[PDB]
């Protein structure tokens, strides 16, 4: 038998003629048989270009084999001379005899080869195979059960991808496991390939990564200054909280923060979270990072809505700090707060999209939403945009026991080129920002006046409460009164504001007041003059009413002491702590800080080198200082997934490549980053990097992994009554770039030498220390909890009829012996 069906065997038994992922074969995959035939008699050898889809030759069961035959005969491949018509195959099924189905399938092969020769290509065949796959539940992508995630699990078939660790949802107070707080503590999975931050080797790699960022410019040989001072921690509610302990440990080891509030405050770190249980967690740990406060939502519900506003009293209570009469130090949870951030603006725009492209797929256009938003922002009767933006900032910037965070997109038109266009709110917000540096310090009292209308008073540096004498020389000339109403039809009336007994018989300047059309900064259109003077007890009598304009819907008024010139009420941090077990303490020295978010998701790509965000912030370094900003939050500077929607930094490909001249990020190059940070340092600011330990989206390398269908907590779940566990999945899991290759684990030896305690301190979740003996030069499933569903499908893995997976040895892959289906391998099969 020199010519025959034995030529269905693979040309060679290796990767050169058989598609495989880690040795495992796919039903969507292709192979090169030795030869092919269009009639059964004449057989021709393949060249290197003549490959065929495996679904012509092998199937997961007799049922699918019969449905393959039936489908192909019904969709173009009918031929009565080879026993293949719509009624000859109509009654085939899984119960049909095996040799009969094999014979019918062999005849179809000949008819397919006739089709191939008629078309001079396999293009139509490839399309028919893909179309057939979608009609089988088990072969299509829909087998993975949208929408959600899968967890990677242990299996001897995917032994390389095994793990002892994968401790899922060890988040916030659930570090130990054991959720007995009846409170929202967050969950492991968000979106993309979830990094196992429970793995000791990964925990060591995070410390490496953090050390790299903290010494960036030095280690790259760029600007020798220009290294990051701290961290904004992304997705802190969705990572094993061990890494929060270990970040704090590293920073304390490097910079000696436990002793000195000065050292702590110069290396400010803060955790992104939308769950109040994080406050408790951080307090128990001595506050290694700042807790993200929820006063933004309160500000939006009370001042920002069009109609159905919450009562003005919500501003005193609706926060991690009660500010009805806040006259103490070191008691409040050290926190950071915001009027807006990049996600808040995004959720506004991404719901305006739902009206413009109604229920449709977004991925395509919608700058029309922004044109609508910009127009709406200028209107009195706003459809979509936030009301009372300046008043929201006035409250945020005058609040005690917090580090306020200003949003780039509230100072600038965020979809324009970087810092090219100022927002309508630039004047109001920057006026309040400079006034903060000059005036706000001391105890806070928020007094309700008429169900709408609240006076928020700060008593000045060294003035603890309303009855105190001043201790500081600036006590007399410091403090602020912020008047905020949220009823645009409020009756015109007079009000009495207690400035404190330290401010008796004192002249106060009208810093900001409301007019018919907007705001005034020299009392021009207002109900009050340029200056008012307190009575003998320090009460200020002021006139107020409802207004309706683009800036104010209700009332906004701000009063500060009359001063001889330049003033600065920033309190310098102590060089010895009050507690010593605490890292951060909510006091006047922390309250003197102020964060600036430098980016938006809707920031454009730069049209020139001069429009690179890093170059623009190098140019404007002194402006940020002049505005009273001392803590610069920079966007994630990492290399991005090319097809990510916003190009923002969160969809990470390479943790260590922050951009080159040839291949910059959205924000610029690494050398530009180093210069930018040095420029900010020269202006007197500290700067922190957005660090993203939760996920890496868009790794290019595929890996054969064993997976189980899970909810966002990483526990197995059911979807419309269906589930699966221990299924083979050909997921995109492997990569990291040349940055990970060259810098991954590079500084673990140095860290071990300098700070041995990093790798002997046992983590709470695991009970073992970070492991510096393995370097992560490349990411793979072994260091991953799982992934969001990748639209590939679960039932493509080729199992043989005996039950075992089909495997192909190939130099890298030596887990098992080579065992392939008889149809494309066994000479002994074809001998019969
Ligand atoms: C995008 C953001 O998603 C997650 O935060 C979610 C909360 O999980 C979710 O509960 C909701 O928060 C509200 C909460 O439900 C409610 O109790 C309270 O009254 O109000 C909350 C705010 O309105 O919505 C937020 C987001 O809108 C994660 O916790 C965040 O880490 C995540 N942001 C990060 C992470 C990624 C990568 O996944 C980036 O896409 C994003 O830009 C970055 O900021
Ligand atoms: Ca996670």
Coordinates of N, CA, C and O in Angstrom, one line a residue, residues 166-242:
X166 N -2.8 30.7 45.4 CA -4.1 31.1 44.9 C -5.2 31.3 46.0 O -6.3 30.9 45.9
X167 N -4.8 32.0 47.1 CA -5.7 32.3 48.2 C -6.6 33.5 47.8 O -6.1 34.7 47.8
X168 N -7.8 33.2 47.5 CA -8.7 34.2 46.8 C -9.5 35.1 47.7 O -9.9 34.6 48.8
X169 N -9.7 36.3 47.3 CA -10.5 37.3 48.1 C -10.0 37.5 49.5 O -10.9 37.7 50.4
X170 N -8.7 37.6 49.7 CA -8.1 37.9 51.0 C -8.0 39.4 51.1 O -6.9 39.9 51.3
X171 N -9.1 40.0 51.1 CA -9.2 41.5 50.8 C -9.7 42.2 52.0 O -10.7 41.8 52.7
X172 N -9.1 43.3 52.4 CA -9.5 44.2 53.5 C -9.4 43.4 54.8 O -8.3 43.0 55.1
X173 N -10.5 43.1 55.5 CA -10.4 42.4 56.8 C -10.4 40.9 56.6 O -10.3 40.1 57.6
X174 N -10.6 40.4 55.4 CA -10.6 38.9 55.1 C -9.2 38.3 54.8 O -9.1 37.2 54.3
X175 N -8.1 39.0 55.2 CA -6.8 38.5 55.0 C -6.6 37.1 55.5 O -6.0 36.3 54.8
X176 N -7.1 36.8 56.7 CA -7.0 35.5 57.3 C -7.9 34.4 56.7 O -7.8 33.2 57.0
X177 N -8.7 34.8 55.7 CA -9.9 34.1 55.4 C -10.9 34.5 56.5 O -10.7 35.6 57.1
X178 N -11.9 33.7 56.8 CA -12.9 33.9 57.8 C -13.5 35.3 57.8 O -13.2 36.2 58.6
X179 N -14.6 35.4 57.0 CA -15.4 36.6 56.9 C -16.5 36.4 58.0 O -17.4 35.7 57.8
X180 N -16.3 37.1 59.1 CA -17.3 37.2 60.2 C -17.8 38.6 60.5 O -18.7 38.9 61.3
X181 N -17.2 39.6 59.8 CA -17.7 41.0 59.8 C -18.8 40.8 58.8 O -18.7 40.2 57.8
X182 N -20.0 41.4 59.2 CA -21.2 41.4 58.3 C -21.1 42.8 57.5 O -21.9 43.7 57.7
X183 N -20.0 42.9 56.7 CA -19.7 44.1 56.0 C -19.0 43.8 54.7 O -18.4 42.7 54.5
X184 N -19.2 44.7 53.7 CA -18.6 44.6 52.4 C -17.1 44.7 52.5 O -16.6 45.8 52.7
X185 N -16.4 43.6 52.3 CA -14.9 43.6 52.2 C -14.3 43.5 50.8 O -13.1 43.3 50.7
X186 N -15.1 43.5 49.7 CA -14.5 43.3 48.4 C -14.1 41.9 48.0 O -14.3 41.0 48.8
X187 N -13.6 41.8 46.8 CA -13.5 40.5 46.1 C -12.4 40.5 45.1 O -11.9 41.5 44.7
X188 N -11.8 39.3 44.8 CA -10.6 39.2 44.0 C -10.6 39.8 42.6 O -9.7 40.5 42.2
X189 N -11.6 39.4 41.8 CA -11.6 39.7 40.4 C -12.3 41.0 40.0 O -13.4 41.3 40.5
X190 N -11.7 41.7 39.1 CA -12.2 42.9 38.5 C -12.4 42.6 37.0 O -13.5 42.4 36.5
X191 N -11.3 42.7 36.2 CA -11.3 42.4 34.8 C -9.8 42.2 34.3 O -8.9 42.8 34.9
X192 N -9.7 41.3 33.3 CA -8.3 40.9 32.9 C -7.7 39.8 33.7 O -8.3 39.2 34.5
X193 N -6.4 39.6 33.4 CA -5.7 38.5 34.0 C -5.3 38.8 35.5 O -4.3 39.6 35.7
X194 N -5.9 38.2 36.4 CA -5.8 38.5 37.8 C -4.5 37.9 38.4 O -4.3 36.7 38.4
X195 N -3.6 38.8 39.0 CA -2.3 38.4 39.5 C -2.6 37.8 40.9 O -3.3 38.4 41.8
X196 N -1.9 36.7 41.2 CA -2.0 36.0 42.5 C -1.1 36.7 43.5 O 0.1 36.3 43.7
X197 N -1.6 37.8 44.1 CA -0.8 38.5 45.2 C -0.7 37.8 46.5 O -0.2 38.3 47.5
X198 N -1.3 36.5 46.6 CA -1.1 35.6 47.7 C 0.2 34.8 47.6 O 0.7 34.3 48.5
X199 N 0.7 34.7 46.3 CA 1.9 33.9 46.0 C 3.2 34.6 46.6 O 3.4 35.7 46.2
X200 N 3.9 33.9 47.5 CA 5.2 34.5 48.1 C 6.2 35.1 47.1 O 6.8 36.1 47.3
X201 N 6.3 34.4 45.9 CA 7.2 34.8 44.9 C 6.7 36.1 44.2 O 7.5 37.0 43.9
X202 N 5.4 36.2 44.0 CA 4.7 37.4 43.5 C 4.9 38.6 44.5 O 5.1 39.7 44.1
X203 N 4.7 38.3 45.8 CA 4.8 39.3 46.9 C 6.2 39.9 46.9 O 6.4 41.1 47.1
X204 N 7.2 39.0 46.7 CA 8.6 39.5 46.6 C 8.8 40.4 45.3 O 9.5 41.4 45.4
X205 N 8.2 40.0 44.2 CA 8.3 40.7 43.0 C 7.6 42.1 43.1 O 8.1 43.1 42.5
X206 N 6.5 42.3 43.9 CA 5.9 43.6 44.1 C 6.9 44.5 44.9 O 7.0 45.7 44.5
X207 N 7.6 44.0 45.8 CA 8.7 44.7 46.6 C 9.8 45.2 45.6 O 10.3 46.3 45.7
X208 N 10.2 44.3 44.7 CA 11.2 44.6 43.7 C 10.6 45.8 42.8 O 11.3 46.7 42.5
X209 N 9.4 45.6 42.4 CA 8.7 46.6 41.5 C 8.6 48.0 42.2 O 8.9 49.0 41.6
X210 N 8.2 47.9 43.5 CA 8.1 49.2 44.3 C 9.5 49.9 44.5 O 9.6 51.1 44.3
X211 N 10.5 49.1 44.8 CA 11.9 49.6 44.9 C 12.4 50.2 43.6 O 13.0 51.3 43.6
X212 N 12.0 49.6 42.5 CA 12.4 50.2 41.1 C 11.7 51.5 40.9 O 12.4 52.5 40.5
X213 N 10.4 51.6 41.2 CA 9.7 52.9 41.0 C 10.2 54.0 42.0 O 10.3 55.1 41.6
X214 N 10.5 53.6 43.2 CA 11.0 54.5 44.2 C 12.5 55.0 43.9 O 12.9 56.0 44.5
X215 N 13.2 54.3 43.0 CA 14.5 54.7 42.6 C 14.6 54.8 41.0 O 15.7 54.6 40.5
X216 N 13.5 55.1 40.4 CA 13.4 55.0 38.9 C 14.5 55.7 38.1 O 15.2 55.0 37.4
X217 N 14.6 57.0 38.2 CA 15.6 57.8 37.5 C 17.0 57.3 37.7 O 17.8 57.2 36.8
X218 N 17.4 57.1 39.0 CA 18.7 56.6 39.4 C 19.0 55.3 38.7 O 20.1 55.1 38.1
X219 N 18.1 54.3 38.7 CA 18.3 52.9 38.2 C 18.3 52.9 36.7 O 19.0 52.0 36.1
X220 N 17.6 53.8 36.0 CA 17.6 53.9 34.5 C 18.8 54.7 34.0 O 19.1 54.6 32.8
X221 N 19.5 55.4 34.8 CA 20.6 56.3 34.4 C 20.0 57.6 33.7 O 20.7 58.2 32.9
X222 N 18.8 57.9 34.0 CA 18.1 59.2 33.5 C 18.5 60.2 34.5 O 19.5 60.2 35.2
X223 N 17.6 61.2 34.7 CA 17.7 62.2 35.8 C 18.0 61.5 37.1 O 17.3 60.5 37.4
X224 N 19.1 61.8 37.8 CA 19.4 61.1 39.1 C 18.4 61.4 40.2 O 18.2 60.6 41.1
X225 N 17.9 62.6 40.3 CA 16.6 62.9 41.0 C 15.5 62.5 40.0 O 15.8 61.9 39.0
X226 N 14.3 62.6 40.4 CA 13.2 62.2 39.5 C 12.7 60.8 39.8 O 12.2 60.1 38.9
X227 N 12.8 60.4 41.1 CA 12.4 59.0 41.5 C 11.1 59.3 42.3 O 10.9 60.3 42.9
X228 N 10.2 58.3 42.3 CA 8.9 58.4 42.9 C 9.0 58.4 44.5 O 9.9 57.7 45.0
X229 N 8.2 59.2 45.1 CA 8.2 59.3 46.6 C 7.2 58.4 47.3 O 7.5 58.1 48.5
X230 N 6.1 58.0 46.7 CA 5.1 57.2 47.3 C 4.3 56.4 46.2 O 4.7 56.3 45.1
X231 N 3.1 56.0 46.6 CA 2.2 55.2 45.8 C 0.7 55.6 46.0 O 0.3 55.7 47.1
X232 N 0.0 55.7 44.9 CA -1.4 55.6 44.8 C -1.7 54.2 44.5 O -1.3 53.7 43.4
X233 N -2.3 53.4 45.4 CA -2.5 52.0 45.2 C -3.8 51.7 44.5 O -4.9 51.8 45.1
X234 N -3.7 51.2 43.3 CA -4.9 50.9 42.5 C -5.5 49.6 42.9 O -4.8 48.6 43.3
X235 N -6.9 49.6 43.0 CA -7.7 48.4 43.3 C -7.3 47.7 44.6 O -7.1 46.5 44.7
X236 N -7.1 48.6 45.6 CA -6.6 48.1 47.0 C -7.7 47.2 47.7 O -7.4 46.4 48.6
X237 N -9.0 47.4 47.3 CA -10.1 46.5 47.7 C -10.2 45.2 47.0 O -11.0 44.4 47.3
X238 N -9.3 44.9 46.0 CA -9.3 43.7 45.2 C -8.0 43.0 45.0 O -7.8 42.2 44.1
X239 N -7.1 43.1 46.0 CA -5.8 42.4 46.0 C -5.6 41.9 47.4 O -6.1 42.4 48.4
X240 N -4.8 40.8 47.5 CA -4.5 40.2 48.8 C -3.8 41.3 49.7 O -2.8 41.8 49.3
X241 N -4.4 41.6 50.8 CA -4.0 42.8 51.6 C -2.6 42.6 52.3 O -2.1 43.6 52.8
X242 N -2.0 41.4 52.2 CA -0.6 41.2 52.5 C 0.3 42.2 51.8 O 1.3 42.7 52.4

